[PDB]
Design a protein around this ligand. Structure first.
Ligand code: UPG
Ligand SMILES: *[C@@H]1O[C@H](CO)[C@@H](O[C@@H]2O[C@H](CO)[C@@H](O)[C@H](O)[C@H]2NC(C)=O)[C@H](O)[C@H]1NC(C)=O
Ligand code: CA
Length: 286
């Protein structure tokens, strides 16, 4: 209850780098705000954001009625670094959950910058984790034509998981109090440091690490409805989706903005609403 007052009832963090992902990140935030009356605070990994995004965020905050905080955490020199920017961004999603946020924040949800929310995110805040420090949705099996690309259903992963789900990292709820109690952050950092000695390991860093650790750092498998991606999930389950991820389709290679406009009817309305807000701020400041 002290976390709800000092911060907000719903706390979401995301990571974005590049104009395309920042444009989608504003849309993700507008989609959250249109679907809840609970208080919201957005948390941003500052060093990857553009100066324009950081200058526009107080205008988004005042227009949509949310609070926000910029977090700048320095990668520890002992911890194996990532030379690829994409892999460093993935490290920021999963390696520092216990230290990016203040001790007074009890719970935080990661929501991908390219996501569209169609639900009250307070329902995820209230989802029962039963002592798991975090919850992720599983990868869908419902789009049968994509079975050849489900790498987690054959080879190394099928033998390692033994039927346990392979989870997607586009969305996850973190009970920070339980995550801290279980020292999950220190354990993920130490395991990542040891596993990353092999440069071929953790190809999908943010996703492979929690899935590899799920027999010792439990994952509360979220209802499949919490994350729908066309690449893996059936058309028929879209009407039940609480959130949508615009995940890459290895078969079609369709561009990101084309996937957004084709799959999500309300995407253009959020995009035009934020562009109208940008034009209004441009005249008021210039
Ligand atoms: O120039 C770029 C490219 C990517 N990203 C971020 O990198 C991640 C992955 O990019 P994305 O376009 O979302 O790829 P997807 O196919 O959507 O990725 C899926 O699979 C990844 C793991 O393989 C997870 O990190 C994603 O959350 C999940 O949506 C996301 O957090 C993006 O915000 C950037 O910020 N800038
Ligand atoms: C947030 O509050 C608004 C009211 O300010 C809610 O809007 C109503 O939603 C119902 C949905 O059954 C509509 O039938 C009404 O016409 C809406 N009324 C108004 C005045 O907008 C909205 O549903 C609330 N959202 C959530 C998720 O609680
Ligand atoms: Ca994504």
């Amino acid at each position: 209850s002290v976390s709800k007052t000092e911060h907000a009832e719903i706390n979401i963090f995301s990571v974005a780098s590049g104009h395309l992902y920042e444009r989608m990140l504003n849309i993700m935030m507008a989609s959250v705000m249109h679907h809840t009356n609970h208080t919201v605070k957005f948390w941003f990994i500052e060093q990857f954001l553009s100066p324009s995004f950081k200058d526009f965020i107080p205008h988004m905050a005042a227009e949509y009625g949310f609070k926000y905080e910029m977090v700048t955490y320095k990668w520890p020199h002992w911890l194996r670094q990532q030379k690829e920017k994409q892999r460093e961004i993935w490290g920021y999603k999963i390696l520092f959950l216990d230290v990016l946020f203040p001790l007074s924040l009890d719970k935080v949800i990661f929501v991908d910058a390219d996501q569209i929310v169609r639900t009250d995110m307070y329902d995820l805040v209230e989802h029962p984790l039963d002592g798991a420090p975090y919850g992720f949705a599983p990868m869908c099996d419902s789009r049968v034509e994509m079975e050849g690309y489900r790498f987690w259903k054959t080879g190394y992963w099928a033998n390692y998981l033994k039927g346990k789900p392979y989870h997607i990292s586009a969305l996850y709820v973190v009970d920070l109090q339980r995550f801290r109690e279980l020292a999950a952050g220190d354990r993920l950092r130490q395991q990542y440091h040891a596993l990353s000695a092999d440069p071929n390991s953790l190809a999908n860093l943010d996703q492979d690490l929690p899935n590899h650790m799920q027999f010792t750092i439990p994952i509360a498998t979220l209802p499949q409805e919490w994350l729908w991606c066309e690449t893996w999930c059936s058309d028929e389950t879209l009407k039940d989706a609480r959130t949508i991820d615009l995940c890459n389709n290895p078969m079609t290679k369709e561009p990101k903005l084309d996937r957004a406009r084709r799959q999500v009817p309300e995407w253009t309305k959020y995009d035009e609403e934020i562009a109208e807000l940008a034009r209004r701020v441009r005249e008021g400041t210039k």
